[PDB]
Write a structure and sequence with these properties.
Chain A has helices at about 15-25, 40, 45-70, 85-90, 100-110, 125-135, 145-165, 180-190; strands spanning about 1-5, 25-30, 75, 120-125, 170-175. By secondary structure, the first copy, chain A, is of the alpha/beta class. Chain A has a single domain, classed as P-loop containing nucleotide triphosphate hydrolases (Rossmann fold, 3-Layer(aba) Sandwich). In chain A, helix 4 (about 85-90) crosses helix 7. The first copy, chain A, is globular, with a radius of gyration of 16 Å. Chains A and B meet through helix 3 and helix 5 of A and helix 3 and helix 5 of B. Bound molecules: 2'-deoxycytidine-5'-monophosphate (DCM) (2 copies) and magnesium ion (2 copies). The site of one magnesium ion has 3 residues of chain B, from helix 1. The PDB classes it as transferase. The entry lists the keywords kinase, transferase, deoxyribonucleoside kinase.
């Protein structure tokens, strides 16, 4: 049983996956923000840091997968699907030029490129996510303007909508109480 | 028969490999500098460009490998990390950014050559060969860069001498004599 957990910053992936974990007894794949050495300067100056950051992320996510395929039962807090989403956001915002974007996408498919039983999309409005970053995120995520969070969220919907038929997506209203979200996830899991 | 051609900038890899090609009838794998969109600004400002550039290179080199019995490789994926290390020793890419690449290179990126032909050459010759046969971009950066690169090529050969079927060619010699030496080594494996 392999469970991807899917959604923007402050959707509540760590919360939801930690809860699933307690209930099922599975480990969480969690690229920990506290070990990422780019994160601290990242938001202070997006133009300079993003490319390198996005590269570090593929490296980190790909290294975990050399350990994830050993195990029958996993929970993924974010997947390798979601990483290109972050690069596209910065591109639409003119924070990484065309060339640097082409390099990544080209790269992503012909260098980097994984079969989830379910992809749980924690669907959430940007307001809630923004306040959940304030409540539960980190120091650094407070630094950048909110337009960034709006485009990211818009780009998550966009991604779900392009790929809805290609992945075993299951949408959870992430506006709901955590208890009710977990209840909904457990019943879907029990039925597969 | 898979032939890697190995050495620093201006050793004469394109010349040597084009010659081998004519003699054997094999295609050349040549990451063409004219298609690399980073190259033009690359040398003008190494700190800004190198990381991205070195990433583009692994991508390009890895994409070619997704393409066959008889090949000649003008530069291999072995030599790419050499360029990143050069810029690191020169403080042109910090520790973090170097760690990211090396980490990456092994656990993301990582291919069996019958021969690795090391076109061994002094930096003076290479510098004058860039001067007459490279391009305008390679003229822009100082020479210390070429000296460390060359030093780092020897270093690499010396660490890996036993792990790859290395064959050293005195690249100071005439092209005709180099080709003569390569063909005889090739004939004695073929
Ligand atoms: N490809 C990625 C993945 C993550 N992050 C950053 C965005 C978040 O601020 C932080 C942690 O992600 P999350 O809060 O969704 O768990 O990592 C990023 O910039 N690019
Ligand atoms: N990993 C690499 C590979 C190549 N180059 C640049 C250095 C050379 O100036 C140019 C062409 O290589 P050569 O003339 O040795 O064939 O490509 C680079 O900066 N980093
Ligand atoms: Mg999280
Ligand atoms: Mg060449």
């Amino acid at each position: 049983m392999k469970i991807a957990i899917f959604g923007t910053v402050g959707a509540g992936k760590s919360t939801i996956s930690a809860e699933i974990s307690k209930k099922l007894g599975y480990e969480i794949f969690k690229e920990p923000v506290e070990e990422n050495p780019y994160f601290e300067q990242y938001y202070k100056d997006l133009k300079k840091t993003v490319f390198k950051m996005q590269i570090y992320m593929l490296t980190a996510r790909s290294k975990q997968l050399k350990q994830a395929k050993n195990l029958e039962n996993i929970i993924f807090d974010r997947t390798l699907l979601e990483d290109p989403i972050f690069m596209k956001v910065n591109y639409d915002l003119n924070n990484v030029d065309q060339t640097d974007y082409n390099t990544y996408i080209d790269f992503y498919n012909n260098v980097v490129l994984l079969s989830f039983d379910i992809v749980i999309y924690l669907r959430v409005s940007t307001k809630t996510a923004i306040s959940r970053i304030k409540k539960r995120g980190r120091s650094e995520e407070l630094l950048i303007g909110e337009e960034y969070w709006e485009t990211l969220n818009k780009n998550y919907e966009e991604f779900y909508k392009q790929n809805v038929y290609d992945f075993p997506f299951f949408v959870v209203d992430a506006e709901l109480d955590v208890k009710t979200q977990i209840e909904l996830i457990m019943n879907k899991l029990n039925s597969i």
